[PDB]
Design a protein around this ligand. Sequence first.
Ligand SMILES: [Mg+2]
Ligand SMILES: [Mg+2]
Ligand SMILES: [Mg+2]
Length: 224
Amino acid sequence: VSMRDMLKAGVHFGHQTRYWNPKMKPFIFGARNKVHIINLEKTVPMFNEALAELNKIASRKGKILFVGTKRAASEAVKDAALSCDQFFVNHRWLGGMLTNWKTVRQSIKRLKDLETQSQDGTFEKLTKKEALMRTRELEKLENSLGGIKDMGGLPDALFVIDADHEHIAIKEANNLGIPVFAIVDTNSDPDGVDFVIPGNDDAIRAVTLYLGAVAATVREGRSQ
RNA sequence: GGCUGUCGUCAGCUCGUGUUGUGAAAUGUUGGGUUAAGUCCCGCAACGAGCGCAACCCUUAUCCUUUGUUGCCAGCGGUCC
Ligand SMILES: [Mg+2]
Ligand SMILES: [Mg+2]
Ligand SMILES: [Mg+2]
């Protein structure tokens, strides 16, 4: 990827000076109208090694999971993962789903059972007293954990948009030695993650081109 | 030992894994509505489960089907009535 399209998306535009984390001193260019301007000359090579490691680990059948719960980016990341032969999560991250996988897999199994019940021609013999509420439980639970139903294991890498808002997940990432690739703007902590690509994390355009670059990266990785 | 009263038919009482704290412990069980109810919905470092609440049990109030004795007498005939 080149600087032109990411500049078009608005990567330089960031947050004001009242909410800047001093942990990212070299990740800044200057101040322009009471809002920080994120440096772009030092963000493309790091993104290059990030993509290189991503496709290197994807070429080895390395499953990765996509995290994003912003209301302006849930559908975009969901579609990117769907077209990116990987897994995704949209709603609130169930705390400890990694460190307590042996309990979440039971919910996965009961989701499969209820899915079979739904597509089994069975939800009509009920006396209209539980079918509707069971259906409601179905869409709630598929919105919750229906994106990793067939995942059946642990990831090798992990990719997050707007790392700060999903800090919880990153913690469980560091509890198990899973490398993390994430993008942090001017109000995040760059110590808990070893793959930093500074940029905006609020515009739909930003997440779209980031997901497109990730998708192309896994395309070229899988052809090895 | 067994059996019984009481708080009180009050709505509460706990467990597994995870996370937080040096620790006794906490969360889950907090918050906004709502109900007789820890009843339900939304949110949420919690995800699930159990005993409790409710339901399944008995009786009373309406209708239908099966049968008419020692129970019944609308329609007929007779009658010491
Ligand atoms: Mg401890
Ligand atoms: Mg002690
Ligand atoms: Mg407690």
